[PDB]
Amino acid sequence: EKLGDICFSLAYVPTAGKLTVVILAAKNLKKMDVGGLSDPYVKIHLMQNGKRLKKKKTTIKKNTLNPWYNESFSFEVPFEQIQKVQVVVTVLDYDKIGKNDAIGKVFVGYNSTGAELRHWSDMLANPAAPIAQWHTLQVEEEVDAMLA
């Protein structure tokens, strides 16, 4: 089933070790609520060798399957470690009095493939520039097995 798509930009400044992720938007998200929509927010994790180094999250948008965020996050990653980390992006539904269930997730960086690997490589090909791309969300369990 189609889970939706996430747009984000990546920028990396190797001399400063500064990685900036901008969560731009999502589109066509799986609906998660009785009212036919979702209340989506996005989590970013910086991972290295299966350990969480840093966690960030966006604000929560209400009643929408097509949120616009334009929210920026900064990470410190030394240049000698840049090909060892993963940036994992998860879209979840917020339910204040229930559970927050994941809609789907993707990751870029170490062991990534296809357009995710190309997005990461294009970040490194264009130092300090914010390269944006749309990515298809994948089933949470399946991505978790790739990250393990």
From Swiss-Prot:
Residue ranges annotated for the C2 domain, each copy included: 2-135
Binding-site residues for Ca(2+) 5, renumbered to this chain: 33, 93, 95, 101
Positions where Phosphoserine occurs in the chain: 72, 74
Positions that bind Ca(2+) 4: 33, 39, 93, 95
Compartment list: Cytoplasmic vesicle, Secretory vesicle membrane; Cytoplasmic vesicle, Secretory vesicle, Synaptic vesicle membrane; Cytoplasmic vesicle, Secretory vesicle, Chromaffin granule membrane; Cytoplasm
Role description: Calcium sensor that participates in triggering neurotransmitter release at the synapse. May have a regulatory role in the membrane interactions during trafficking of synaptic vesicles at the active zone of the synapse. It binds acidic phospholipids with a specificity that requires the presence of both an acidic head group and a diacyl backbone. A Ca(2+)-dependent interaction between synaptotagmin and putative receptors for activated protein kinase C has also been reported. It can bind to at least three additional proteins in a Ca(2+)-independent manner; these are neurexins, syntaxin and AP2. (Microbial infection) Receptor for C.botulinum neurotoxin type B (BoNT/B, botB); interaction is improved in the presence of gangliosides. BoNT/B toxin binds to the membrane proximal vesicular domain of Syt1 (residues 32-51).
Family: Belongs to the synaptotagmin family.
Protein name: Synaptotagmin-1
Taxonomic source organism: Rattus norvegicus
Parent sequence residues shown: 271 to 418 of 421
